[PDB]
């Protein structure tokens, strides 16, 4: 729990991590009775496949803290289903490439989140182009 | 046993060995019920590899030379790591299980295996 | 008249075959293009990795 | 050298040892098989089979079905079959008596069909038991 | 019957040629991709060396 | 006490798995009979090709009334297997009321028996004892009921519900149409999907990764053509008439073995 939960966050974070907080709530219950129902319809299964990928985002290496923009960017990618296609062992290696891609190719995204501190429409679009560009590159 | 401490290669093998060993432990109840033939082709293997790994872990000691007579083997950390790659990569699937038992180096098991084949042929 | 009948039928059958021939040729063209594009991408990626590794 | 027999029930292959002669009932009433028989397919009525190989010939009552006989080979599809030696005769006779009694009572268009087919079933059980 | 074979041949060739034209284009995309990748790898290698030289100098400090 | 319970339940689980393996072996033993029967039943249809031939089991009559036979488990402590079947049974009875074509239930097994005893607002044809290790003896008394009941026109389109053993983790009830046997020998569900009878899949339980699973795999059994010189002893219609009960008997036995 954090008592001061969301007056704490920045505006980009509050918007981005609003999705995230719910999906994990779904995914606590969908991991429950997952082997009980055991023939998973794609209403439950895709929300359960989304969930495993969501857990991967939460994973991090020790003493490699992320910048606020990276967290906002990383949370956003996972929530939308962009990483759904990727293998569970591919998610952590992808995102590291996507963050590095974005620092290197698209530094306008950092300037929006660091100044406006709000997950702007310009910012959101600006990320997607890197995600499309980055995703294409990752495949080959 | 963290990757930043022991290196990436050592960690992967150790993790794999535990998993292979762990699966075999789970499968023991199943194997009695279904037998080794009835298991799938992956689990004929991770049972076999687990058995070889179990035998490979056992080693002859310097101190026990008096009691058992077979000479002990001090085994390096690299020769240990290289040994469990060749079992888990499957390049030594053809060897019998009692070629991995009470040998030091990975080479000794192969050497022991060959000698066993010659003795059997005799 | 028999020759005329044959000519017309052959002309039509030949047209169908050529149309079939063209379709297969276009499928081959598309496949070759796809394979080539993949090479470019993959090739460059590999190069950087090997080059990136050497630099590192 | 001889024809070979495999009698088989929906759960259990009963007789798969091979013989010089059998003689089986059918809906026509009776047939006999001897080796290198022509290819025939007979629906076999419920009632006893008699099989002779070598010294000894014994009857296992079997409960109807199908019997094809190919080149050098018989296979008999029967829904239930018992060896006549393995059934103890007296108990089978008692069962037959019970069936008859129920039949005598049994009435109505389906029910008699059941009674009649059950007494037909029971009566052939002793006829392998005695034989 | 006549109208069928011709169509098949027409459509067919439109398709083989098209497929191989696509092959060429890809041969183009890959060709492009390879160049970009090579340049990126060189820059990345440059990255490593440059930054590690910086790390050295900081160590000297 | 809790530790003792854990040991006891674990022992029960192991015993149940062994019993399931034994059941699988049992299904395999009856494979020659159903492989040979569908080979005959194919060639008896491909030889026949005759409009004047009508067999009573396959005879089609107006569906005024339907018989539903319910193959439930013998004992408790097995998840929702029994609850699911009876619950699924109710939908079929409910569905008939929408059609109003006078259901009748033949119940097999104790938990199905104790269900339809305590609820008398249903007809029952008969109460059958359940059985572990089902035999052709024990499927015959089912068959002598249903065949006799079906031949008389009181009941039509007798259908059976039971659980095809699809997965360990879930096994949903499925309802098939037993009678009137299709002359093609095709076996199909009430919904309207019919598999060719030549191809059926046995269930084999194997371990996938660490876990214990089951995979239902189907091997088609090809039917060799009947001999050119073959002589039919009775009549083709008549020979076929003897054949249909064997097929019905064979099917009821598999429905119950699979349920077990």
mmCIF file with all atom_site columns, C-alpha atoms in Angstrom, chain D residues 9-108:
data_model
loop_
_atom_site.group_PDB
_atom_site.id
_atom_site.type_symbol
_atom_site.label_atom_id
_atom_site.label_alt_id
_atom_site.label_comp_id
_atom_site.label_asym_id
_atom_site.label_entity_id
_atom_site.label_seq_id
_atom_site.pdbx_PDB_ins_code
_atom_site.Cartn_x
_atom_site.Cartn_y
_atom_site.Cartn_z
_atom_site.occupancy
_atom_site.B_iso_or_equiv
_atom_site.pdbx_formal_charge
_atom_site.auth_seq_id
_atom_site.auth_comp_id
_atom_site.auth_asym_id
_atom_site.auth_atom_id
_atom_site.pdbx_PDB_model_num
ATOM 1   C CA . UNK D 1 9   ? -15.785 -59.652 -27.993 1.00 0.00 ? 9   UNK D CA 1
ATOM 2   C CA . UNK D 1 10  ? -16.114 -55.834 -27.656 1.00 0.00 ? 10  UNK D CA 1
ATOM 3   C CA . UNK D 1 11  ? -13.632 -55.819 -24.765 1.00 0.00 ? 11  UNK D CA 1
ATOM 4   C CA . UNK D 1 12  ? -11.724 -59.070 -24.990 1.00 0.00 ? 12  UNK D CA 1
ATOM 5   C CA . UNK D 1 13  ? -10.176 -61.327 -27.631 1.00 0.00 ? 13  UNK D CA 1
ATOM 6   C CA . UNK D 1 14  ? -11.194 -64.780 -26.494 1.00 0.00 ? 14  UNK D CA 1
ATOM 7   C CA . UNK D 1 15  ? -9.896  -67.475 -28.814 1.00 0.00 ? 15  UNK D CA 1
ATOM 8   C CA . UNK D 1 16  ? -6.809  -66.787 -30.889 1.00 0.00 ? 16  UNK D CA 1
ATOM 9   C CA . UNK D 1 17  ? -5.294  -70.251 -31.070 1.00 0.00 ? 17  UNK D CA 1
ATOM 10  C CA . UNK D 1 18  ? -5.636  -71.951 -34.370 1.00 0.00 ? 18  UNK D CA 1
ATOM 11  C CA . UNK D 1 19  ? -7.611  -75.004 -35.301 1.00 0.00 ? 19  UNK D CA 1
ATOM 12  C CA . UNK D 1 20  ? -8.318  -77.587 -38.015 1.00 0.00 ? 20  UNK D CA 1
ATOM 13  C CA . UNK D 1 21  ? -12.142 -77.409 -37.854 1.00 0.00 ? 21  UNK D CA 1
ATOM 14  C CA . UNK D 1 22  ? -14.945 -75.383 -36.331 1.00 0.00 ? 22  UNK D CA 1
ATOM 15  C CA . UNK D 1 23  ? -18.690 -75.691 -36.839 1.00 0.00 ? 23  UNK D CA 1
ATOM 16  C CA . UNK D 1 24  ? -20.866 -72.738 -35.919 1.00 0.00 ? 24  UNK D CA 1
ATOM 17  C CA . UNK D 1 25  ? -24.500 -71.800 -35.808 1.00 0.00 ? 25  UNK D CA 1
ATOM 18  C CA . UNK D 1 26  ? -25.896 -69.025 -37.965 1.00 0.00 ? 26  UNK D CA 1
ATOM 19  C CA . UNK D 1 27  ? -29.226 -67.485 -38.864 1.00 0.00 ? 27  UNK D CA 1
ATOM 20  C CA . UNK D 1 28  ? -29.556 -69.946 -41.732 1.00 0.00 ? 28  UNK D CA 1
ATOM 21  C CA . UNK D 1 29  ? -29.205 -72.540 -39.008 1.00 0.00 ? 29  UNK D CA 1
ATOM 22  C CA . UNK D 1 30  ? -25.894 -74.397 -39.255 1.00 0.00 ? 30  UNK D CA 1
ATOM 23  C CA . UNK D 1 31  ? -22.621 -74.258 -41.139 1.00 0.00 ? 31  UNK D CA 1
ATOM 24  C CA . UNK D 1 32  ? -19.284 -76.055 -41.044 1.00 0.00 ? 32  UNK D CA 1
ATOM 25  C CA . UNK D 1 33  ? -15.810 -74.770 -41.808 1.00 0.00 ? 33  UNK D CA 1
ATOM 26  C CA . UNK D 1 34  ? -12.838 -76.723 -43.103 1.00 0.00 ? 34  UNK D CA 1
ATOM 27  C CA . UNK D 1 35  ? -9.491  -75.406 -44.256 1.00 0.00 ? 35  UNK D CA 1
ATOM 28  C CA . UNK D 1 36  ? -9.073  -73.482 -47.502 1.00 0.00 ? 36  UNK D CA 1
ATOM 29  C CA . UNK D 1 37  ? -12.765 -72.622 -47.337 1.00 0.00 ? 37  UNK D CA 1
ATOM 30  C CA . UNK D 1 38  ? -14.168 -70.271 -49.946 1.00 0.00 ? 38  UNK D CA 1
ATOM 31  C CA . UNK D 1 39  ? -14.635 -66.664 -48.751 1.00 0.00 ? 39  UNK D CA 1
ATOM 32  C CA . UNK D 1 40  ? -18.006 -66.404 -47.040 1.00 0.00 ? 40  UNK D CA 1
ATOM 33  C CA . UNK D 1 41  ? -19.604 -63.951 -44.610 1.00 0.00 ? 41  UNK D CA 1
ATOM 34  C CA . UNK D 1 42  ? -22.339 -65.242 -42.316 1.00 0.00 ? 42  UNK D CA 1
ATOM 35  C CA . UNK D 1 43  ? -24.292 -63.435 -39.655 1.00 0.00 ? 43  UNK D CA 1
ATOM 36  C CA . UNK D 1 44  ? -23.977 -65.821 -36.725 1.00 0.00 ? 44  UNK D CA 1
ATOM 37  C CA . UNK D 1 45  ? -27.005 -66.469 -34.527 1.00 0.00 ? 45  UNK D CA 1
ATOM 38  C CA . UNK D 1 46  ? -26.779 -66.618 -30.748 1.00 0.00 ? 46  UNK D CA 1
ATOM 39  C CA . UNK D 1 47  ? -26.183 -70.200 -29.758 1.00 0.00 ? 47  UNK D CA 1
ATOM 40  C CA . UNK D 1 48  ? -23.262 -72.498 -29.355 1.00 0.00 ? 48  UNK D CA 1
ATOM 41  C CA . UNK D 1 49  ? -20.166 -72.863 -31.490 1.00 0.00 ? 49  UNK D CA 1
ATOM 42  C CA . UNK D 1 50  ? -18.317 -76.168 -31.736 1.00 0.00 ? 50  UNK D CA 1
ATOM 43  C CA . UNK D 1 51  ? -14.644 -76.094 -32.631 1.00 0.00 ? 51  UNK D CA 1
ATOM 44  C CA . UNK D 1 52  ? -12.495 -79.103 -33.387 1.00 0.00 ? 52  UNK D CA 1
ATOM 45  C CA . UNK D 1 53  ? -8.743  -78.900 -33.427 1.00 0.00 ? 53  UNK D CA 1
ATOM 46  C CA . UNK D 1 54  ? -6.780  -82.140 -33.313 1.00 0.00 ? 54  UNK D CA 1
ATOM 47  C CA . UNK D 1 55  ? -7.843  -84.448 -30.494 1.00 0.00 ? 55  UNK D CA 1
ATOM 48  C CA . UNK D 1 56  ? -10.366 -82.326 -28.709 1.00 0.00 ? 56  UNK D CA 1
ATOM 49  C CA . UNK D 1 57  ? -13.508 -80.443 -29.644 1.00 0.00 ? 57  UNK D CA 1
ATOM 50  C CA . UNK D 1 58  ? -15.351 -78.108 -27.275 1.00 0.00 ? 58  UNK D CA 1
ATOM 51  C CA . UNK D 1 59  ? -18.278 -75.712 -27.404 1.00 0.00 ? 59  UNK D CA 1
ATOM 52  C CA . UNK D 1 60  ? -18.225 -72.125 -26.256 1.00 0.00 ? 60  UNK D CA 1
ATOM 53  C CA . UNK D 1 61  ? -21.656 -70.565 -26.352 1.00 0.00 ? 61  UNK D CA 1
ATOM 54  C CA . UNK D 1 62  ? -21.507 -67.179 -28.005 1.00 0.00 ? 62  UNK D CA 1
ATOM 55  C CA . UNK D 1 63  ? -24.137 -64.513 -28.277 1.00 0.00 ? 63  UNK D CA 1
ATOM 56  C CA . UNK D 1 64  ? -24.546 -63.686 -31.928 1.00 0.00 ? 64  UNK D CA 1
ATOM 57  C CA . UNK D 1 65  ? -23.016 -61.255 -34.343 1.00 0.00 ? 65  UNK D CA 1
ATOM 58  C CA . UNK D 1 66  ? -21.070 -61.690 -37.532 1.00 0.00 ? 66  UNK D CA 1
ATOM 59  C CA . UNK D 1 67  ? -18.625 -64.227 -38.897 1.00 0.00 ? 67  UNK D CA 1
ATOM 60  C CA . UNK D 1 68  ? -16.611 -63.695 -42.045 1.00 0.00 ? 68  UNK D CA 1
ATOM 61  C CA . UNK D 1 69  ? -14.199 -66.358 -43.220 1.00 0.00 ? 69  UNK D CA 1
ATOM 62  C CA . UNK D 1 70  ? -11.448 -65.397 -45.597 1.00 0.00 ? 70  UNK D CA 1
ATOM 63  C CA . UNK D 1 71  ? -8.545  -67.165 -47.177 1.00 0.00 ? 71  UNK D CA 1
ATOM 64  C CA . UNK D 1 72  ? -6.963  -69.495 -44.598 1.00 0.00 ? 72  UNK D CA 1
ATOM 65  C CA . UNK D 1 73  ? -8.688  -67.527 -41.841 1.00 0.00 ? 73  UNK D CA 1
ATOM 66  C CA . UNK D 1 74  ? -11.831 -67.003 -39.777 1.00 0.00 ? 74  UNK D CA 1
ATOM 67  C CA . UNK D 1 75  ? -12.704 -64.005 -37.658 1.00 0.00 ? 75  UNK D CA 1
ATOM 68  C CA . UNK D 1 76  ? -15.911 -63.962 -35.645 1.00 0.00 ? 76  UNK D CA 1
ATOM 69  C CA . UNK D 1 77  ? -17.411 -60.809 -34.191 1.00 0.00 ? 77  UNK D CA 1
ATOM 70  C CA . UNK D 1 78  ? -19.659 -61.697 -31.292 1.00 0.00 ? 78  UNK D CA 1
ATOM 71  C CA . UNK D 1 79  ? -20.924 -59.328 -28.633 1.00 0.00 ? 79  UNK D CA 1
ATOM 72  C CA . UNK D 1 80  ? -20.467 -61.866 -25.838 1.00 0.00 ? 80  UNK D CA 1
ATOM 73  C CA . UNK D 1 81  ? -18.948 -65.336 -25.750 1.00 0.00 ? 81  UNK D CA 1
ATOM 74  C CA . UNK D 1 82  ? -18.111 -67.792 -22.970 1.00 0.00 ? 82  UNK D CA 1
ATOM 75  C CA . UNK D 1 83  ? -16.348 -71.122 -22.959 1.00 0.00 ? 83  UNK D CA 1
ATOM 76  C CA . UNK D 1 84  ? -18.803 -73.911 -22.232 1.00 0.00 ? 84  UNK D CA 1
ATOM 77  C CA . UNK D 1 85  ? -16.427 -75.598 -19.820 1.00 0.00 ? 85  UNK D CA 1
ATOM 78  C CA . UNK D 1 86  ? -15.804 -72.428 -17.832 1.00 0.00 ? 86  UNK D CA 1
ATOM 79  C CA . UNK D 1 87  ? -19.486 -71.915 -17.120 1.00 0.00 ? 87  UNK D CA 1
ATOM 80  C CA . UNK D 1 88  ? -20.661 -74.286 -14.403 1.00 0.00 ? 88  UNK D CA 1
ATOM 81  C CA . UNK D 1 89  ? -23.695 -76.069 -15.778 1.00 0.00 ? 89  UNK D CA 1
ATOM 82  C CA . UNK D 1 90  ? -26.044 -76.032 -12.806 1.00 0.00 ? 90  UNK D CA 1
ATOM 83  C CA . UNK D 1 91  ? -25.856 -72.286 -12.225 1.00 0.00 ? 91  UNK D CA 1
ATOM 84  C CA . UNK D 1 92  ? -26.527 -71.677 -15.905 1.00 0.00 ? 92  UNK D CA 1
ATOM 85  C CA . UNK D 1 93  ? -29.536 -73.977 -15.661 1.00 0.00 ? 93  UNK D CA 1
ATOM 86  C CA . UNK D 1 94  ? -30.776 -72.009 -12.659 1.00 0.00 ? 94  UNK D CA 1
ATOM 87  C CA . UNK D 1 95  ? -30.372 -68.789 -14.628 1.00 0.00 ? 95  UNK D CA 1
ATOM 88  C CA . UNK D 1 96  ? -32.331 -70.335 -17.479 1.00 0.00 ? 96  UNK D CA 1
ATOM 89  C CA . UNK D 1 97  ? -35.112 -71.247 -15.062 1.00 0.00 ? 97  UNK D CA 1
ATOM 90  C CA . UNK D 1 98  ? -35.216 -67.692 -13.763 1.00 0.00 ? 98  UNK D CA 1
ATOM 91  C CA . UNK D 1 99  ? -35.335 -66.334 -17.295 1.00 0.00 ? 99  UNK D CA 1
ATOM 92  C CA . UNK D 1 100 ? -38.190 -68.646 -18.190 1.00 0.00 ? 100 UNK D CA 1
ATOM 93  C CA . UNK D 1 101 ? -40.152 -67.644 -15.137 1.00 0.00 ? 101 UNK D CA 1
ATOM 94  C CA . UNK D 1 102 ? -39.728 -63.953 -15.897 1.00 0.00 ? 102 UNK D CA 1
ATOM 95  C CA . UNK D 1 103 ? -40.683 -64.542 -19.539 1.00 0.00 ? 103 UNK D CA 1
ATOM 96  C CA . UNK D 1 104 ? -43.854 -66.332 -18.538 1.00 0.00 ? 104 UNK D CA 1
ATOM 97  C CA . UNK D 1 105 ? -44.868 -63.241 -16.602 1.00 0.00 ? 105 UNK D CA 1
ATOM 98  C CA . UNK D 1 106 ? -43.332 -60.748 -18.972 1.00 0.00 ? 106 UNK D CA 1
ATOM 99  C CA . UNK D 1 107 ? -45.850 -58.898 -21.089 1.00 0.00 ? 107 UNK D CA 1
ATOM 100 C CA . UNK D 1 108 ? -46.104 -56.059 -23.587 1.00 0.00 ? 108 UNK D CA 1
#
